[model samples]
Target chain A: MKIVLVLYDAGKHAADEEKLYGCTENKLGIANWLKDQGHELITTSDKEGGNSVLDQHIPDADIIITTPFHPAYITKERIDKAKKLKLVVVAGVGSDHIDLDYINQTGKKISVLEVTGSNVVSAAEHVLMTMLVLVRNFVPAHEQIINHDWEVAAIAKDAYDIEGKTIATIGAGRIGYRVLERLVPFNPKELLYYDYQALPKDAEEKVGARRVENIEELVAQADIVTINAPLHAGTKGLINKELLSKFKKGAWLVNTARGAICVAEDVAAALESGQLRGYGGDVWFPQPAPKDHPWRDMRNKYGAGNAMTPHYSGTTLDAQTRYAEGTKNILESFFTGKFDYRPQDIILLNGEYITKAYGKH
Target chain B: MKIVLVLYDAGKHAADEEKLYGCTENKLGIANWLKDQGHELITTSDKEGGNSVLDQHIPDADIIITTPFHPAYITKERIDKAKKLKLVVVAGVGSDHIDLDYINQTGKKISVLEVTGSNVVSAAEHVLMTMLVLVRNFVPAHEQIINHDWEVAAIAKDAYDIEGKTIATIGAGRIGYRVLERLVPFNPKELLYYDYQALPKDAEEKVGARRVENIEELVAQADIVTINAPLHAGTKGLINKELLSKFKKGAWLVNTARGAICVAEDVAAALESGQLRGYGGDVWFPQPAPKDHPWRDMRNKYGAGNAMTPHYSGTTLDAQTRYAEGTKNILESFFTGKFDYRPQDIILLNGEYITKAYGKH
Candidate 1:
């Protein structure tokens, strides 16, 4: 079998002295694993357009592996042309880039899987980090130090404690629940969530979080709000200007879930007018956000409190190790003809959609 | 009575809309409060040397209030000259700048007081924030976003999870114990501590932490070490080059305690040579680090891993409100001839040192 892998380039960033598994150069250091099995592996950091190596290699590949960081958007057109494509694996969670309906049809029956839960802890930790970064005004404070200046007053003017502030998450899925769970120790004044279904009572008690039937009510009460819902038709642009206006004045928002949930322009404007104190997280509307993305320079009226970061929160070294091992295990199962994948890992299999996230689309 | 206040400058940074309290421009916002009490208040951001405004005002001032942020060193000469000075109150914690022996002598009896426990929570939260910022490699990741670069591999190579890492603190006092308590929910593999005295059993069990008899043993096993001990003859330069050599290679070190505890050159060198993974905290060897301070540009072997900030971790808005109230309360008691200050708040009273920190000196 021929396997094609698409990921970001580490450049000189990943030295031999410190091996990095998240780069296409190493191909998660799985080239030898595939080679020992008498399989051909092609790894490329290029997945930009129709003429990219990803496109060139996918036609004859039996299986394709891609990551959320450098996704190879498997459009319907490309899926139709990949006559030999039998399997697709997401190295990390989230398979929104793929056209699930087209690839998992009754006749084609392609299997789609992800290393589920591998990066949930990493992403959850990132949410807490981003919240503190924004609430504490850490970005401006560090910038002052880097500029070799000490202005405690300038930085502390907007800095605040995460304690005694009402915090709410938009969804209570795996990542969202974990965010609330971790936040319990910080002693937030109130923890609220908005989701279609209420979380388990034991889980709610674990985090001291309550579910709000109305999303707007949760937003209106929260001093800080974090988005943890998946990117779906219902959630895309859910936090638009109107919804954001309903948020408590000068409230901070963290979005590590997906970038499309909030309109980029609205977030920037909210920050500019002081309607929002800060906006921060790892995900961006487009992976590898364009140079002119509004958030890159967005700040409050005081010229501080911006904590934006690239989409790498879930790709920490620990998360990479877990996901890489999961990918290897999936391959092992596939080659052995057992095909006994973890149930939660399968998004689509045997011409059936297994996840609710894609079923709505 | 005339009260002199010395603090950092807010300049044009504090617009009428911002209303910062911890700057000389506002005098911790005690100008109005002091005026209402029929007292004269002199606020100056200058506290640099013997010829500064602080020196000019000290001789006639009945009470002096200063913050750790912009300390007016109450040296032996200043204390001798201040014939009318009966009280020296630290608006926040840490009164190391004051010459305790000279001021609280049998003949002088100048009371040295601080708002104890006022900013400890703010400080403990900052420790968690700093730890995550370093472990997650937040600084360079943020810089990349600002520079419009999306190098996921670059950031992830150094980024790590705080979970499952063995974290230890040098002192298990108020700030150190609180850091461990907050770290509990993050699920660290082990929490170790090194202090002169064993912590209360209840406190130790709260964080599932163990006390190590030897400091070197704790450092050798810790993936991350935080210094929360006070600055004194016994602890000064505690984490010098010789001691740091005992640390796990590439271990992260956090010093939110007094900066003098760790040798500055050793830390900068460790970062450069890859002996340390990251070094961060709010404290520095000197307040207002010189423009050419080594840490401002210090990077690890990979050219990243620096997360320094000005010393405002204990001066968040919530903290400022608390310390400001405590300072006001101390003044009220003093002016009323009650001298009814909280026992723990007094570092020196009746010509005797009250805290162990100063007694050692």
Candidate 2:
């Protein structure tokens, strides 16, 4: 049996520190274990091109593992090529990189799963970091320190405290609810959420959170909006010109969920037009976005609006350990033929989308 | 009465938005009120050198107002010049900018006070923002975005989650205790504080925080150490290399407290030597630190450490509003000849230090 893994390249970090288990250089720390099990394990950061290692191994690979941080985004042609593909493991949460519907179209009984809770804490932590960095005008403040400049009032005028502002999250899933829970102590005016279904009564009371009936109302009331929904057919372009128009003027938006949930150009336009106060997020539309991606240079006149970062929040060292161990546990279960997969980890099973987050495709 | 106001210049932001009350450009939104009250109010951003506004007004000004954000640091010599100075109001917290010992050196009774609790929430918000920005490797990740690069592994390798780490604060006053309460929901392994006295049992139980007997003991076990102690003679230079050596290796140090609290050269050295993983703070030893201040361009090899900012965290727009009103209230009481000062706001009374944070002189 052959297993292929695609992960981000860590350059000298993996060599300098062996604890970087999620990097291609470190092979998720599962390589030795896989080798001892009499299975051939192949790993590479080069998964983009047709002549890449991922493409070269697609025809014969029995198991494939990918991470959302640096995804091995797959298409229908690659799925058709992988005749022996039995299982696909997302080393971290979110499997939008893979074309789930196309894989289902082929009617192949392939199983797709992820380490569900591994990235939740890290992502939720990132969510608030983005909001604070933007609202507090941290980037420009730090910029002034390094640039040998000191202008307190300029940054302070744009900077704000989260003390009494109303905050809202787009979804109330494992990551979203944690974001709400974490924000409770900040003493926000109120916490609102936009989700298809309401949370349990006790859960809502636990964090003093209220459910907004629709996304429009959520954005309309929130001084800050955090996106926690998955990227899918329904969520794609959900935060476009029309939706952003309904948002409270000067409202900050933080998206650690998925980049496509926002219209990149529209968000940038909103930032420039002062319709949206600031925009911050991790997931870019395509991993390793081109040098000229608008968000890279996007910010208001005061240089406080943009809090863009290379999508690394969910793959923090702490998250890495959890997902690596979880991925290994799944491998162990598969190798033993016990198939004892955690119910929540199963996204696509038996040629069908199993998680409501991705919708019934 | 001749009143002098020294505030930071907001430039266009003040002209664009008239609500910026803490800026010299806008005169704290009280110039008209002072004029209507039949008082002469002198305001300027310049307080340094012999030929400055602060010096010009020193002799005749009966009431002087200064902000910690851009301090008009006064010495004993200035106290001798201000023959008619009956009151000195710190527009925000921390009276360390002025030489409290020198102010009391003269036998003449003078009242000095601050708008207590005005900047607490803003400063606390900045404290955590610094911790997150440093631990999450935000700057380098942001650099990658604008530089048109996407390398997640290098950042993810150094990034961390605050969820399970042990965090400690040097003081547990309004700002420090708020930091403790804010971090509680993040589910840190433990919360510890080092102070002269233990928190009330109810307050300790409120946030599940413990008091460490000594500063040395606090840093030893904490993954993150935040400096929240006020900058006084006792606390100045407290976080020198000697104390920093006892810190958990690769630990993060956040100081929204004061810049002088930590030795400037020692922190830069530790960051380079990988002794302290990261250092972040807002206050500087000198307001508008010289272009050559060491903390400005300091960072570790992988570019994940430095989170310095200009001293503006305590003067955020929200904070300015609160402090402005508090400053005005203090002025109103003085004008009424009532001097019914809030006990907590008094830093000095009858030619002696009234607050223990500064100590009796």
Candidate 3:
């Protein structure tokens, strides 16, 4: 079987100047593992747009592995051209980069699987970090220290304590529930979540969380709102200007979920007018945001309040190891003809899209 | 009455040019409040040395108000020179900036007071943020995005989940105990503390924290150690090279208590040698760390891991409101000849040191 792995480059730092374990340079960290099985393995970091290395290898491959960090947009056109492809594996969670409908196309039996729950803790921790970074006004404080200046008045003007502030998370799934659970000890005045279904009583009681009726009420009451729901037809552009207007003025928002959940310009404008105190997150609408991405420089009316980082929250070394091992296990199961994948891991199986997160699309 | 207020300048951006409202710029935020009482208020951010405005006004001033942010360093010489000084008010907590022994000197009856508990919540919140920033590798990840780079592998290689790590705090007073309590939901593998007195049984049980026999035992076993002890003779240079050698390899250390507790160069060396993974806090040996301060550019083997910020953690807007009110109330009582103050807020009453944190000096 021919396997093609699409990943991001680690530059010259990779061992052997090309491959390193736990990095994209190592191609899902399975190049040697696959080669030892006498299978042809192709790896490349060039997976953007058409005519890329990933596209050049996908047509003849039996398996394709990709990561959200450098997703290969498997559009219907590419799926149709790859006549021999039988499996697509997400080395990490969040497989929205894949066009699932194409996998469910008539006469196709492609399988979509991901290493689920591998980065839940990492992402949850990132949510807590982002929230505190905004409320405590940490980024601008550090910037002042680096710039060789000490202005306590300016730094303290907008800084606040997180204790007693109301915090809510959107979508209490694996990531969202963990965020709430972790936030419990901070002694927030209230912890609320907005989801289509109510959480188990025991789960809600653990974090002392209450369920909000809808997103409108959630945003309206929260001093800080964190996006934890998956990206889907139901959530795209969910936090636009009209919805943000309902938020407590000068409230902070954290979005470690898909960036598209918020319209980029709406967030920027809210920050500019002081409608929002701060916006911090790990995801962007487009992966590898261009150098001029507005978020990189956007600030509040006070000239301080942006903590945007690239999508590394869920890709920490510990998470990388967990997901990389899970990916290997899935490939081994496929090779052994067991096809006994974890039910939750299979997003597309039995010739249908399995998870409801992506909706009926 | 003539009151001398010594604080840090907000530079060219004092009033309309920049946002300034804390004790520093507003001079305890009580200039107008004091002026309303028909008193002379001399406010100046120049308090660096003997020839500074603070020393220049000491001889004839009826009262002196200073803050830890821009301490006036009321040494024995200054105390002796200030013939008419009757009260010295610390706008915030920590009276270490003053020489308690001089206040206790024969034939003198100076009073020292601070706004106790005013910024404990703010300082505690900052400790949590600094801990997360260091463990989650936030500083470097943010730097990569701001530099217009996307190298997930490099960022991930250093980032790790804060869960399952051992964290301990030194000196479990109001700030230290709050740090441990706030860290409860993160589910640290172990939470230990080292203090002269054992915490109350209820306090210990609330967070499941244990008391270490000594600093050696605490540092030897903890993955992260946060210093929250007062700056006293017993705690000065407490985390020096000799004590740091007992720490777990690549351990992280946080100091939000006082900067003199740890030798500056020792921390810089530890980071360079990879003995410490990261160091984060809001204190410096000298307030307004010089541009050439070693920590300003120290890095680990990865060229990352420094989360230093100006000493503004305890001066957030919320904290300012609390301390500013406390300062105003104290001034009002003094002007009315009441001398009515919270017993605990008095560091030295009637020419005698009341608090023991200064180690009988």
Candidate 4:
């Protein structure tokens, strides 16, 4: 058996003199672990070349593991040639990188699985922190402190209260629901949510959340808009510039969801003009957003409030352990032909699509 | 009546500049409204003298309004000369800038008060943010983003979970109570708070927070510690090196209270050695920490997870309005000889003393 891991380049980690992970470059522990199991393992991040590192090792692999943070897009062409591949495991949640329709049609028993619940806590916490950074005006205050000035009244003017505002979570799945539940004690005036499957009446009552029947109402009424909805045909690019206009003036926006669900250009513009008080999340549309990416330089005008973050929240050490173990469990189950799926990770299985909430395959 | 606002320095409000008050300064409106009352108003932030702007008009004063952000240290000599100055109002909370012990001895009864609740929300929110920044390893993750690198395993290696930790708050005042209430939802393993005045048993039960009579015990056992207590002989430098040694290994410390309450050098050394995970809160021992303040330049090798913030939280725009109006109200009441001392701001009033919490005065 062969396992192929398609990860993005770890140039900095590779160049580091630190020895926490390994003694040499590319010491992520995956190569030795798989090889010791009497299985051949191929790990390469490059994907552009036809004879690229990923292409060279991918064809005969029985198991494929990839990350959503720096996905190696597995196309239909690549899937067509990979005859011996039995299971494709998303090392993290989110399997959009794999072409599901093509795999299902080829009668390939290729079970696409992922380790769920691993990043929910990390992502939820990040969303909350980013919201505070934007709404409370953090960036500029920090700049002033580093500059060694003490203008008390100067910084207080743009600072605000997050308690009385109305907030909406665009999707209320595991992470979305957890974020709303955590915010409940902060006593936000209201918590509105939009999800394909309605939360149970008792659960909604326990958390004190409201369900918006329409997306337009959810967008228009929220003071802080958080996108927790999954990415699929229906929800993709759901929060574009036109839809953002429905948000209250100076509303805060956060997205720990797939980055493609948001329009990056509009978010930058919103932060610039004060249409949005601030914008933040643990994700960008494309992983490894280029250094010259627009949002990297988009600063709060008074310079104290914006709270953007890199996409590392979901991969926090604790989360990595959980997802990594889960990914291994999924692989072993797939190989032994006794796959017992965690209900949360079963997007579609058994030739019958499950959890139609996201979209049809 | 003539009102003089002293202590206008670089750290003071730059209402005319961009990023004014964390990017959206809005104080001109309040100044205009005050002028409409037929009261002559002078707003200048010059405290240091020799043709200092404050000195030029100190001799012409009746009412003085200053802030602790950039304090206007009023000496007894100045207070004696300010015979016509019947009131000194602190725009924000904490009025250590005015020498209360001397003022009470004079029997002139110059009322000194602060707008209570003006910055409690900001301070409370800041404490939580600081806690997360330290516990979740936010600073290094943030730096990694700016440096344009991504290493999931390397960063998560030291990052941690805050959900099951035990946290304690030093003071159970308004700010302390709010912090406890907010912590309820985070659902830590347990909540322990220490205060001179016991919180009502009913209040404690409502939030499931445990009250610790001996402050030393709580510090020894808690994983996260927050300071909301006041600055006084008993509490000044309370978190000295000796007490910090009692804290649980790798515990997180927060102080949104006065900076002088902690021995700055000792705390910085603890952070450097990882005796403490990280140190946060805006209050510095000195109102304006020097450019080379150790905390400003601290990094992970010197205690990697620190989330230090400038003195903010209480001065957000919403708080400014509340405190500014409260300052004006205190002044108006004194000039009219109808002062109603806000309970929270009553440090010392008469020779016999008034505040029960600190009665020896």
Candidate 5:
């Protein structure tokens, strides 16, 4: 049996290649175990040219593996070109790169699987940290200490008390819920959440959070708005210029969800005008954003209050280990036809979807 | 009758006679009432000198007004010489400058009284703010923002989560009780307090605090130490280097009580070496600390973290108005012995007796 994995650039080949060979950037060191079982694995970040090595070998590959960070967009044309592709596996969450409608329409039995519970805590904690960084004016304050200046009034006036402020999480999924749980101790005046799926009554009471049936109402009232919903067509640009205007004056905006969910320019403008006090997150539209990306140096671009960064919150080294093992487990389940999809990760699957949590645009 | 109010200094005049005349820095513009009353009022900022205006007219002075910020330090010599001195009133809480012994020994029957509860809330808020500033490294963080650098690991390595830490307030008086009450939401693991007198057995549970029998033992365990005890001989130097050494490693110390309680050099050295994480308070020895005071530019001073200010916490404009009026009421009571004293303010009376709850020092 042979397996082919298409990954984005990993830069250097760090893992050994026996039968379970991993190409540059991929680190599946299980080549020895796979070889012993008479199996072969091939991996490559190179997927573009027509006569490319990835294309030459794709016809005979059984299982296709890729990651969301450096996604391999498995279009209908590519899936049709592969003769032996039995299953498509996403090592991490978000199978947006795959053409789900095409696969289901063709009746191709490609079971898509993803690792779950792996990066939930990591992403949630990042959301909380980013919120604090923006609200407390941490980045600028940190800079002042290093620069050795004592201009306290400049920062203190911007620095606010986190207590008694209203914070709204845009989505109340596993990651969003965890973010709210951590924020409970800060003694926020109110915690609101908007999601298509309602949380249990008991869980909501435990955190003293109210469920806002309408997303617009929640956004309008939020003093600090955090985005945690997945970036599907419905959620994409959910925080646009018009939506951002609904925010309270001097409110903070934080998004640890997919960066595409927000209109970047609008957020920057709001921050500049003092409408949005600050903006912060680790997620960027294209992971490993280009050096000249506007958000990269937003302090100078948007003013001094934005805290943008390279996307590593979900893939922190600790999270990488959790996700790597979970990814492996997901692959094994697909091969054995003994799938145990994590409830949180079963966002959409098969002709009959597993989750009614999201909807069409 | 003419009122000759001898305020110790400019601040004394600002808070006392000027306030009474509504001669605010930004004038409240209400001087017509006193003029209409046809009573002559003299306000002086002259604190000291052989030519002190109080000296020229002490024989005919009916009432003298003073304050702790610029204490008059009335000696037995002045008390014996001023044959017409009938009342000495403090515009603030502590009335320590008056020679109580001279008033008691001589049959002059001069009454001394101070306004109570005027600044308790403001002082309590400052105590908590200063405690958080010291414990959380507020000043350095604020400094870092002005300098424009972002070093998460650099600052976080020193910063800590306040939850699960022990906080001990050395006194549980009006201000101390409020301090403990406000901290309840921060979720500290334990709260211990030491007072010369123990609160009722029921108070420990009601206030969610533990009364420690031994001060040293409580100091040994507290991650944050706040001093709210009054200034007296036994409590004056309570937080010297020897006592500070018992605090846990990386502990924080706050002194809103009195500057004499802490040795400034020892604190600066402690903060410099990381023995003490930080120290903060609005009070400093000799009131107007020189520019070279060790604390003004201590090495570990995280921005806004050090709550030292010019003794304004307890004297907020709101509290100032209340205490000033209370001072006038006390003066009225003394000139005509119609109003009894609030028992709490009678910390000591008739030379040998004190308030029932003040306990032994």
Candidate 6:
């Protein structure tokens, strides 16, 4: 059987042994294992264009592994070309690049799986990092050091503590609930969450969290708002000009969920107007997010609140290790014909949607 | 009665109403109050040089208000010149600029106090912020966006999560204890602290933290170390080359407590060697930390992990409000001849050491 892996180019970082799992050159630390088992492995970072290495491997591929951090889009034509592709594994969570409905269009049984929950802890910590960076005015202060200047006044004037501030999350699923729990010790004035359904009693009580049926009420009272909802019909474009106007003046925002979940232009405009003091996340639209993206260097009134970063939070070294291990486990079962994959890991199996994200909808 | 207040220059930040407390011109929002009480208030950011505005007022001052954020050192001549001085108040924590023992040498009953615990939450949150920023490799990622570049592989390659890593603090006092509790929900592999004495049983159990008998063993195992210990004989220059050599390679360090705790050159050297992957704090030896301070732009081997900032973490807007309100309350007692000061707030009383940091030492 033939396998192909689409990963980011390691560049000089490949010299670091721990970075084995996420780069094409390192082959996810699993090349030997697969090859020893009489399977052919082809890996490349080039996933685009007619001369794409991944496209060349597609027709003969038995399994393909990809990551959301550095995704390779498997559009309708690409998926149809992989006639021998028995399995498509997401090395990290999210199957956005491969259309689930398109898979349904084909009558063939193609198993689609992901390394579920691999980046939850990683992603949740990124939200905490983003919120603190923005509210504490970290980027500018650090920037001043590198640029050979000191401006404590500019830094502290807009800087604030999360301890006494009202903080709310747009959703309270695994990552959001973890974010709420992680923030409890900070002693925020109020812990609020906006979700269609309230969390269980114990979970809510554990963080002293209050659930708001509507996001509008939550944003108005929150000094800091974090978006953790999965990007979908209900969540896409959820934060826009009209909704941002309802936010408390100078409130900080963090979105690690997905980029399209927000209106990019509205966020930049709010930042310029100081309607949102700071906005940050590791996720961005069009994933490598064209260099000309307006959000790249936007700032609040004081020139102190830009905290955007490349989308790498979910692929931290620890996360890469977890995801790589999970990917290997999924392949082991497939090779053994055990079909013993974790139910949550299976997005599609035996020609039908199996995960809550796709099947339930 | 006349009062002299020394604070940092607000610059353009003076326009911010919330920056009401730490700036000289804004006068900690107390100028009008002092004036209403039929007293003279002198506020200035000019606390340096022989012809300092504070020095000019020192001889006539009945009370002097200063902050650790922008400290005005009161030396022997200045203390002796102020014959009418009855009290001196620190608007924020740490009365480091003044000579506590020399106040006793003056053979006068002058009162000195600080608003204790005012910036504890603000500061503890900073340690959390610094640790996450460094471990997640945030600065470089954010820098990329600002530079109109994308480096997901560069960022994610060296980035790591705090979860499942051993975290330790140098002192388990107010800020240190708060840092531990705040990190509890992150599920670190272990929580450790190194201090002269063990925390109370409940405090230790609250976060499942361990107290190492000595600092050497603690650093040998800790993946991340935060310094919250007060700067003094036992702790001053504690993180020098010899001590750093005992640390696990690629460990991260944070020191919001004081800049003197770690040797400046040693830190830059460690960061260069990658023995310490990252180092950050909002404190610097010379408050303004000369333009050439090595820590200003230090980074690890990957060209990431430098998290230095000016000394402003403890002076956030929330903290300014706290310290300012506390300073006002302290001055009110002095004005009314009550001297009903909180014991924690009193560093010197009747021209003698009072607080544990000074008296107990």
DockQ of each: 0.74, 0.81, 0.58, 0.42, 0.05, 0.79
Tens-place lDDT digits, model 4, residues A284-335: 7666677776666675566534455566677665566667677677766765
Ranking by DockQ: 2, 6, 1, 3, 4, 5
Q: What is the per-residue lDDT of model 5 for residues A122-151, given as tens digits with 9 covering 90 to 100?
A: 666666656655665555544443344333
Q: Give the per-residue lDDT of model 6 (tens digit) for B24-140.
A: 768888878888999988888888888989888899899999887777888787887988988999998877677666877665788898899999999999999999998998988
What's the distance in Å from true for residue B355, model 6?
A: 1.5
Error of 3 at A38 (Å): 3.7
Model 6, docking class: medium
Tens digits of lDDT, candidate 2, A104-218:
7768788898999998989998888888898898988888888889888768778889989999998899899999998888899999998886799999999999999978888
TM-score between candidate 5 and the true structure: 0.58
Error of 1 at A280 (Å): 1.1
Report lDDT (Cα) of residue A210, candidate 4.
Answer: 95
Comparing only chain B with the true structure, the TM-scores of all models are 0.94, 0.97, 0.95, 0.88, 0.82, 0.94
**Per-residue lDDT value at B214 in model 3:** 80
Residue B14 error for model 2, in Å? Answer: 2.2
Looking at model 5 chain B, report the run of 10 residues with the lowest lDDT sum: B21-30
Best by lDDT: 2
Q: Using lDDT as the measure, what is the rank order of every candidate, best first?
A: 2, 6, 1, 3, 4, 5
Q: How close is chain A of candidate 6 to the true chain A, as a TM-score?
A: 0.93
User: Cα lDDT of model 1 overall?
Assistant: 0.85
Error of 4 at B9 (Å): 6.2
Docking class of 2: high
Candidate 3: tens digits of C-alpha lDDT, residues A205-312: 999999998788888999999998877768889999999999999999999889889999999999999899999898986887788887877888777778888888
